[PDB]
Amino acid sequence: TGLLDGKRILVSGIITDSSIAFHIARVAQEQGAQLVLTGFDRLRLIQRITDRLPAKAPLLELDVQNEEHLASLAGRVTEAIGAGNKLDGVVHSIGFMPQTGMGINPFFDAPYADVSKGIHISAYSYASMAKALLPIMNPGGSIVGMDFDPSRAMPAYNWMTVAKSALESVNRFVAREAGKYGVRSNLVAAGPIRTIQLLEEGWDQRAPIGWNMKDATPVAKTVCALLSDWLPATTGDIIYADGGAHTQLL
Amino acid sequence: GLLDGKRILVSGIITDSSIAFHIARVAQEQGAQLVLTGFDRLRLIQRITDRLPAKAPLLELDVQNEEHLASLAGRVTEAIGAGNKLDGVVHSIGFMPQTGMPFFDAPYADVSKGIHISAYSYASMAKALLPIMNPGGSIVGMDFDPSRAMPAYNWMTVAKSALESVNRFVAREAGKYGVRSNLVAAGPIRTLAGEEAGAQIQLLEEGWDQRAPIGWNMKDATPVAKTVCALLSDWLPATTGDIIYADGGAHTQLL
Amino acid sequence: GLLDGKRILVSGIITDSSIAFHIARVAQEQGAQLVLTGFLIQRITDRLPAKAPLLELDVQNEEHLASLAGRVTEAIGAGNKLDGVVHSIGFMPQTGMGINPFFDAPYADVSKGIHISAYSYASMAKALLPIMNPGGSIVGMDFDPSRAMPAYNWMTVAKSALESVNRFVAREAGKYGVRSNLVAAGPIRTGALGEEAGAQIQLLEEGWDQRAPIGWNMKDATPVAKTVCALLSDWLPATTGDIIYADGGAHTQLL
Amino acid sequence: GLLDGKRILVSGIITDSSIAFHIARVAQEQGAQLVLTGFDRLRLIQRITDRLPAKAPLLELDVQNEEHLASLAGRVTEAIGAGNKLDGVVHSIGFMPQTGMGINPFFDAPYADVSKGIHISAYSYASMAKALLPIMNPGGSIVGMDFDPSRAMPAYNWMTVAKSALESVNRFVAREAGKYGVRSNLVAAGPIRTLGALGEEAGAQIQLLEEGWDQRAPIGWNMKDATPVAKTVCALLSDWLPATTGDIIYADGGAHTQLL
Numbered sequence A: 001t002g003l004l005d006g007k008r009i010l011v012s013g014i015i016t017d018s019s020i021a022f023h024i025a026r027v028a029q030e031q032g033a034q035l036v037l038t039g040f041d042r043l044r045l046i047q048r049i050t051d052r053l054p055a056k057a058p059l060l061e062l063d064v065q066n067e068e069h070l071a072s073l074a075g076r077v078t079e080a081i082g083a084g085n086k087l088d089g090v091v092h093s094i095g096f097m098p099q100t101g102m103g104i105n106p107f108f109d110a111p112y113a114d115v116s117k118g119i120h121i122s123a124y125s126y127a128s129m130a131k132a133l134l135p136i137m138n139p140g141g142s143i144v145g146m147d148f149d150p151s152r153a154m155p156a157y158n159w160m161t162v163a164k165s166a167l168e169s170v171n172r173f174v175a176r177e178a179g180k181y182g183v184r185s186n187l188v189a190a191g192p193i194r195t196i197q198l199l200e201e202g203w204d205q206r207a208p209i210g211w212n213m214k215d216a217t218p219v220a221k222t223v224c225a226l227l228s229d230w231l232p233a234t235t236g237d238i239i240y241a242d243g244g245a246h247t248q249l250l
Numbered sequence B: 001g002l003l004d005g006k007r008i009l010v011s012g013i014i015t016d017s018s019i020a021f022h023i024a025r026v027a028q029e030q031g032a033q034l035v036l037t038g039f040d041r042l043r044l045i046q047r048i049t050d051r052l053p054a055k056a057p058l059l060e061l062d063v064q065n066e067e068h069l070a071s072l073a074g075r076v077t078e079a080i081g082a083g084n085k086l087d088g089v090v091h092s093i094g095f096m097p098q099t100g101m102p103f104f105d106a107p108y109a110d111v112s113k114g115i116h117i118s119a120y121s122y123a124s125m126a127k128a129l130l131p132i133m134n135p136g137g138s139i140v141g142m143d144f145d146p147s148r149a150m151p152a153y154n155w156m157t158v159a160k161s162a163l164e165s166v167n168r169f170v171a172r173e174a175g176k177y178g179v180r181s182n183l184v185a186a187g188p189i190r191t192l193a194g195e196e197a198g199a200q201i202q203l204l205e206e207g208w209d210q211r212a213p214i215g216w217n218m219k220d221a222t223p224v225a226k227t228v229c230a231l232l233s234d235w236l237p238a239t240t241g242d243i244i245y246a247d248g249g250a251h252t253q254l255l
Numbered sequence C: 001g002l003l004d005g006k007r008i009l010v011s012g013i014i015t016d017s018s019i020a021f022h023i024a025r026v027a028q029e030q031g032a033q034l035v036l037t038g039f040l041i042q043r044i045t046d047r048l049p050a051k052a053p054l055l056e057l058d059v060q061n062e063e064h065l066a067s068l069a070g071r072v073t074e075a076i077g078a079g080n081k082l083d084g085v086v087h088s089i090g091f092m093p094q095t096g097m098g099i100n101p102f103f104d105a106p107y108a109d110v111s112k113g114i115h116i117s118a119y120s121y122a123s124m125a126k127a128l129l130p131i132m133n134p135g136g137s138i139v140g141m142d143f144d145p146s147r148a149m150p151a152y153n154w155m156t157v158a159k160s161a162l163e164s165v166n167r168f169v170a171r172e173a174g175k176y177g178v179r180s181n182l183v184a185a186g187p188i189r190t191g192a193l194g195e196e197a198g199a200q201i202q203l204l205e206e207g208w209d210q211r212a213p214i215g216w217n218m219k220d221a222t223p224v225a226k227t228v229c230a231l232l233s234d235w236l237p238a239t240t241g242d243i244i245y246a247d248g249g250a251h252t253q254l255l
Numbered sequence D: 001g002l003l004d005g006k007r008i009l010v011s012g013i014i015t016d017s018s019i020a021f022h023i024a025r026v027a028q029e030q031g032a033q034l035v036l037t038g039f040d041r042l043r044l045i046q047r048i049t050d051r052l053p054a055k056a057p058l059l060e061l062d063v064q065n066e067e068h069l070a071s072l073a074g075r076v077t078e079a080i081g082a083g084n085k086l087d088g089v090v091h092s093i094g095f096m097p098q099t100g101m102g103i104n105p106f107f108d109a110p111y112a113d114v115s116k117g118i119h120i121s122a123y124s125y126a127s128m129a130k131a132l133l134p135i136m137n138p139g140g141s142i143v144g145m146d147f148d149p150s151r152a153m154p155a156y157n158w159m160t161v162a163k164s165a166l167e168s169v170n171r172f173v174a175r176e177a178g179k180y181g182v183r184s185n186l187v188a189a190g191p192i193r194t195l196g197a198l199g200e201e202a203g204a205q206i207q208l209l210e211e212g213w214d215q216r217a218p219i220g221w222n223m224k225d226a227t228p229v230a231k232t233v234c235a236l237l238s239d240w241l242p243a244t245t246g247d248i249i250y251a252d253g254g255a256h257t258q259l260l
């Protein structure tokens, strides 16, 4: 009697048990989903983190910058879920921006090689993952990616804010492609999660229902709502799981 | 069910084509216990609500009537039982006289009545019902994206722009009770409501299904009803003062 | 001069701190010939650098609106038309803006506020478009209402309605080859509400200058008057139904 | 003139149909003293800049070339004279290979092509501001060209993504430019006929996208004419929008404000 009973869902982005993807995976399993997980570089380490989830799930390697990993992804997922079975959901919870482009480094001092790598991993890969997986997705399916509202500039986030602005645009185009398969594509724009202090503290102040940066469960639940059959007419869009902070000036 | 055990008030049923009728039907299929509110044609509304899968008390509510608003919480408490509170409230009410739906020829008395019913009443209903809502509760109102002007919708577009602003303020008040307030912006639905405006609205409708990456079926209110039920559930707990678009993704595409 | 030879109507002067006073002053410095409307004001308008006829205009008065074009034609001379119109009018009773809880504003007060602050932008365009030249410009004053905030309450709702009205006025004005736009200004200084509200409104103001990349001086209306004159000029000829922000860039920054 | 005595750098001229050519022409008609920058085909660009109403020095600038960016301020100072600074900077540069914009499926654009397009179309707005802010006067203005990317559309594909990135870059450039008392803004223009080549199907789709624009625009939209766009850029370069920064001004006939 779970929200995602019987659904086959791929979840990328687990690195620690504080990863937003770890909480998404935990809630999806509690709700009856059968998962396939993807990890980057430190696969033995990631496998040990995935052992903390309530149910066993196969772990596949996926470096989104690696064309060979993307070319073989659908075949490897099909081995994991069984021939004749397809995915009902895909979760993109991947991001990266070198220290030259996010933090205390001046915005103007980020070399383009660093910005390009960050945009490749954080934005272009949302299209790459949809390209690889839409041929193995069922109608009524759902692709969800993680976002941080980039509509206004802010301290420190710098080039990662630019990568999120690009990701929002990529999501609208992925929705055009996914619609051909009867699949939805949406982003969840979350408030800050402890996975800068003054900026982050502003969310709880503005949020009419408050914001707890130490609690990823409300974000995971929102992703699961989009993976469910309960938002069937929403695509190319952004759902804000931020306590309502973006709707208030002060 | 998605809403098992939840006590939810649903306003705005007039016909079985009303978006509120479909919201009520889906909510009951999902285990919710409803309280319904109707305006003016109560005997007629009772014949329509007899078509729902489960019985529900029907209370009169004219949002322009201060006495109805002053007594609403007490009448709802009588219907659900002393000691019980609401978990959800659905505002599915709108009105704009014909004059407001040429743009310049709408008299202010007509525009004011339309804004009272379509936008101010969202605050009126929250004021009356928040004192009888449980923490984790949810208030949901119906919207039609008014970010851009369009043919014929005219002053009702202005009322929706005011409603979006009212929703952001209601969220500030509702938060004090641990309650969320959000709007669902739906695509056009064939509910009961000249040649020029007729042709323009036909073009607006056709364009909607063309732009929507997953298409849009104006004869099917179920996807909209499901979206309202998602907001009434425990599955969007960090969303408030916001707008969820149940429009096939049409607003995200230019062509 | 930026506005050399242009005939421009300017509403909204009540004191020499009114944003409309600064708009009128800058427009005259830039060579415009003005017609002023107000609703005692002659002593204030005598402080402008040049003489200008002052006509009475209560935007809630249907007779004033019906006779406005004829009265303006008498003032500027038969055979002459207006090139610009400035709406710098706003009103909200203390029940709807200030310290009063959002839920305690009666609709009669909110409706009067929306009539004067939003509907009148359409009323003024209806009255004046028949006497405007092609290439003309209508400009109204706005305060960004995209997010809720303390104290502004129902005046925020009136601005949300005004932004929607501006998009529809642009549709009508386009038929005459006239543009319609709003200038969304930062706060301008045009303990009276208590210690608590005073501190909250002070924080709202300090944050504005903090967020604005070029800063924001609440005591200086000249950057706002210059922005309105840019829209009245021939230099933004392809902008209509839109909003230009003269707020130091504060709305583009989170912190 | 609106820009009398102002020293303004204008990048992006390649043909006399370039939006930058019209921005330069209007700026000179309004009394500005220009410095022009061009990419790769400098001899060809000089023949085009001879068509402007006044002479202006032409400097080479490939925005992907770190050496050109490192020497730019010094070369501009030589052109305008020691002790003089710029009052304006216009970025009117964009590029996206055919794999990322046109008829090619959105999913078939390789990242090397997308990355080159984002480097030239978005990151270079920050590169140019970094190089030129040290030689800009207080009250100065940086303006870049945009095409509203808030909604997806046919064919524009990854160039839409590059514009979404550019809008975000503009908000961060405004934070840096403010330290110098300089504004940074974008002008989002409607479609302009700059330089059946893409086939019947795509041709009809792009034609519908264009016609819809003049239909939506309450004052209409003339796709042949960059002058209303050039005038809008000059308004931002002037002293008449002194409190606008990190922002976007739409010179699109009001099309983006109307659904139909």
Ligand SMILES: NC(=O)c1ccc[n+]([C@@H]2O[C@H](COP(=O)([O-])OP(=O)(O)OC[C@H]3O[C@@H](n4cnc5c(N)ncnc54)[C@H](O)[C@@H]3O)[C@@H](O)[C@H]2O)c1
Pocket: A012, A013, A014, A015, A016, A018, A019, A020, A021, A039, A040, A062, A063, A064, A065, A092, A093, A094, A095, A096, A121, A146, A147, A148, A189, A190, A191, A192, A193, A194, A195
């Ligand atoms: N932490 C927050 O405050 C916050 C708020 C809103 C949105 N988000 C977003 O949520 C997502 C997850 O971030 P997180 O906070 O959980 O941090 P995280 O560090 O736990 O997760 C980021 C993941 O990206 C993966 N990744 C990096 N390079 C990759 C590559 N080449 N191929 C594949 N995967 C790669 C990492 O291995 C890691 O699992 C990101 O998109 C982030 O931007 C985070």
Ligand SMILES: NC(=O)c1ccc[n+]([C@@H]2O[C@H](COP(=O)([O-])OP(=O)(O)OC[C@H]3O[C@@H](n4cnc5c(N)ncnc54)[C@H](O)[C@@H]3O)[C@@H](O)[C@H]2O)c1
Pocket: B011, B012, B013, B014, B015, B017, B018, B019, B020, B038, B039, B061, B062, B063, B064, B091, B092, B093, B094, B095, B117, B142, B143, B144, B185, B186, B187, B188, B189, B190, B191, B192, B193
């Ligand atoms: N039909 C669509 O295309 C569409 C699209 C998006 C949003 N909506 C919105 O959905 C909501 C419901 O509209 P609908 O299309 O189902 O039409 P409807 O006619 O079935 O419902 C409108 C309801 O408003 C009620 N109402 C009017 N005046 C009232 C008053 N004084 N007090 C109380 N109730 C009053 C009517 O009695 C009726 O039940 C409205 O907010 C509407 O704007 C409709």
Ligand SMILES: NC(=O)c1ccc[n+]([C@@H]2O[C@H](COP(=O)([O-])OP(=O)(O)OC[C@H]3O[C@@H](n4cnc5c(N)ncnc54)[C@H](O)[C@@H]3O)[C@@H](O)[C@H]2O)c1
Pocket: C011, C012, C013, C014, C015, C017, C018, C019, C020, C038, C039, C057, C058, C059, C060, C087, C088, C089, C090, C091, C116, C141, C142, C143, C184, C185, C186, C187, C188, C189, C190
């Ligand atoms: N911080 C601010 O002061 C600020 C910021 C942004 C925008 N604005 C807007 O600028 C405009 C002018 O406001 P202001 O700050 O100069 O204040 P103000 O009090 O000087 O101007 C308001 C004007 O509205 C007029 N008005 C009221 N009722 C009227 C009626 N029935 N008929 C005709 N005119 C009527 C008043 O006579 C007055 O001239 C308003 O739209 C306001 O919302 C103000």
Ligand SMILES: NC(=O)c1ccc[n+]([C@@H]2O[C@H](COP(=O)([O-])OP(=O)(O)OC[C@H]3O[C@@H](n4cnc5c(N)ncnc54)[C@H](O)[C@@H]3O)[C@@H](O)[C@H]2O)c1
Pocket: D011, D012, D013, D014, D015, D017, D018, D019, D020, D038, D039, D061, D062, D063, D064, D091, D092, D093, D094, D095, D120, D145, D146, D147, D188, D189, D190, D191, D192, D193, D194, D195
């Ligand atoms: N044409 C339209 O419909 C339209 C609409 C809105 C915005 N815009 C924007 O206006 C700007 C100018 O485009 P246009 O339509 O005038 O086309 P264009 O081809 O005439 O201008 C593009 C310019 O970018 C230059 N450029 C490319 N690579 C470069 C590099 N490595 N270094 C330096 N410069 C480089 C080219 O040499 C050329 O001068 C672009 O930002 C474009 O996106 C165009």
Ligand SMILES: CNC(=O)CN(Cc1ccc(F)cc1)C(=O)C[C@H]1CC[C@@H](NC(=O)c2nnn(Cc3ccccc3)c2C)CC1
Pocket: A094, A095, A096, A097, A098, A099, A102, A103, A104, A148, A155, A156, A157, A160, A192, A193, A196, A199
């Ligand atoms: C070897 N070098 C890395 O491997 C670069 N590194 C490590 C690192 C980056 C920045 C930093 F300073 C410290 C450490 C990354 O690539 C980490 C990723 C993790 C996933 C993504 N993470 C977020 O998007 C995210 N992290 N924190 N926040 C909150 C926030 C809000 C506002 C301002 C600042 C922060 C967000 C929204 C993108 C960055």
Ligand SMILES: CNC(=O)CN(Cc1ccc(F)cc1)C(=O)C[C@H]1CC[C@@H](NC(=O)c2nnn(Cc3ccccc3)c2C)CC1
Pocket: B093, B094, B095, B096, B097, B098, B101, B144, B150, B151, B152, B153, B156, B188, B189, B191, B193, B201, B204
């Ligand atoms: C007697 N006179 C009234 O009693 C006015 N009447 C009845 C009536 C209206 C129009 C009409 F011809 C005939 C009758 C109303 O006040 C009904 C309400 C019902 C609830 C609300 N309904 C919508 O908001 C709604 N109705 N249709 N659409 C689609 C659409 C989209 C864009 C443009 C046009 C249409 C919408 C979005 C607001 C109007």
Ligand SMILES: CNC(=O)CN(Cc1ccc(F)cc1)C(=O)C[C@H]1CC[C@@H](NC(=O)c2nnn(Cc3ccccc3)c2C)CC1
Pocket: C089, C090, C091, C092, C093, C143, C149, C150, C151, C152, C155, C187, C188, C192, C201, C204
């Ligand atoms: C003659 N009796 C009326 O006519 C009532 N009165 C006069 C009055 C009201 C309050 C007060 F104590 C003293 C005087 C009005 O109705 C004033 C109008 C003037 C024009 C409009 N004014 C603004 O829109 C405006 N005023 N202040 N701010 C800054 C701000 C920002 C955020 C929060 C709070 C403040 C704004 C944006 C709308 C209100």
Ligand SMILES: CNC(=O)CN(Cc1ccc(F)cc1)C(=O)C[C@H]1CC[C@@H](NC(=O)c2nnn(Cc3ccccc3)c2C)CC1
Pocket: D093, D094, D095, D096, D097, D098, D101, D102, D147, D153, D154, D155, D156, D159, D191, D192, D194, D195, D206, D209
């Ligand atoms: C003649 N030049 C280009 O072909 C040259 N190449 C390479 C190329 C060659 C052949 C080809 F076959 C496609 C692309 C460019 O990379 C030029 C740049 C110029 C600056 C930028 N240009 C625009 O941004 C721009 N160009 N057209 N439009 C209107 C529009 C709107 C919506 C959909 C489609 C079109 C826009 C908004 C981006 C492209």
